[PDB]
């Protein structure tokens, strides 16, 4: 499923990502745009053999099992295929585990590069939330 910006903002709010662990809603919409262009089925293979999955490009070396990744750790205890659903439930749940570490949203390169230090709330303006 490919989300619109405000459609995803509304879905992320329903999934409890407004103000989760100190991060406002816009952070998550901004992250999704630059990671996956709002596409739940996005995949990206890395040189190291790991793959990024879903709307937030969550990596198989650390977070999910894809059966293909060398020193994979499966911290979210989920098949990576679950992160591809049009239902964003699993991506959100795994994102919340990731962000509950002291690294916070710094786990996502696209977020550090494109979102951190910007007016993130701009990502949720114009939306009937």
């Amino acid at each position: 499923k490919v989300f619109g910006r405000c459609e995803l903002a509304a879905a992320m709010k329903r999934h409890g990502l407004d103000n989760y662990r100190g991060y406002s809603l816009g952070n998550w919409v901004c992250a999704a745009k630059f990671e996956s262009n709002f596409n739940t089925q996005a995949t990206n293979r890395n040189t190291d053999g790991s793959t990024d999955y879903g709307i937030l490009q969550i990596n198989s070396r650390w977070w999910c099992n894809d059966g293909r990744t060398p020193g994979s750790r499966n911290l979210c205890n989920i098949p990576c295929s679950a992160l591809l659903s049009s239902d964003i439930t699993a991506s959100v749940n795994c994102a919340k585990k990731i962000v509950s570490d002291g690294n916070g949203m710094n786990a996502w390169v696209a977020w550090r590069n494109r979102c951190k230090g910007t007016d993130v709330q701009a990502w949720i303006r114009g939306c009937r939330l």
Partner: single-chain antibody
Framework: DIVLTQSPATLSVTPGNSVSLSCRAS??????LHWYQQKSHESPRLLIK???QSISGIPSRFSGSGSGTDFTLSINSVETEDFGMYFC?????????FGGGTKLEITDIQLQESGPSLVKPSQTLSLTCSVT????????WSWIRKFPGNRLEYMGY???????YYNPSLKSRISITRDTSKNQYYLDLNSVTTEDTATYYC???????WGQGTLVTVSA
């Protein structure tokens, strides 16, 4: 801190009847409200996560609803096995906090706590959790305690970077550490008082795997 208020405090019900347990929050927490069942001194069992999401192996009769500040656990036709305490827990904001509980009256990986059963005021309490079945580097790890009047307190957790989160109520007396080579992680609580008399639990941060709990009594 987020205060979670549960009502009713106690409920009596006949099997086959349905019940609704309410949890309200002092501030908005989105969908970040989880439900536990706890039976007279065993570890809590996670029933519903994120307000409405089903947990594998949990019976169909349990369902959750709500959002923001208002939440409900529903039991669609209660069975005798459903007796126990029911606790809500929020995960929106550190520190995680539990509701006060509702007494319902009806008319792979393993964790093992070890430590002293009796400690003296002002000594250090040291606990070990031994993890079987997976490496400790593959999850986040928590400590939780239950005070004698059924009150639950989330003490802390350590995550993948080694960053720790401690309940501020513990005022810097707590330390959580790991030993990868031993597959153990630890709780140290300094300068204990009789206020630290509790049953202590280790658990993974996900709330799926719990130790059995260990009662520690602080006495002169």
């Amino acid at each position: 801190d987020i205060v979670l208020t549960q009502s009713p405090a106690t409920l009596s019900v006949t099997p086959g009847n349905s019940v609704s347990l309410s949890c309200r929050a002092s501030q908005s927490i989105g969908n970040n409200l989880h439900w536990y069942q706890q039976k007279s001194h065993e570890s809590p069992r996670l029933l519903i996560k994120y307000a409405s999401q089903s947990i594998s192996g949990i019976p169909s009769r349990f369902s959750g609803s709500g959002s923001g500040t208002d939440f409900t656990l529903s039991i669609n036709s209660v069975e005798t096995e459903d007796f126990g305490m029911y606790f809500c827990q929020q995960s929106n904001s550190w520190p995680y906090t539990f509701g006060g509980g509702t007494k319902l009256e009806i008319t792979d990986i393993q964790l093992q706590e070890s430590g002293p059963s009796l400690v003296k005021p002002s000594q250090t309490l040291s606990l070990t959790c031994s993890v079987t079945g997976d490496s400790i580097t593959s999850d986040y790890w928590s400590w939780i305690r239950k005070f004698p009047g059924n009150r639950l307190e989330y003490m802390g957790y350590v995550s993948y970077s080694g960053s720790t989160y401690y309940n501020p109520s513990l005022k810097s007396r707590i330390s959580i550490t790991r030993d990868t080579s031993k597959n153990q992680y630890y709780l140290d609580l300094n300068s204990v008082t009789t206020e630290d008399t509790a049953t202590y639990y280790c658990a993974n941060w996900d709330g799926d795997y719990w130790g059995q709990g260990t009662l520690v009594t602080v006495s002169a």
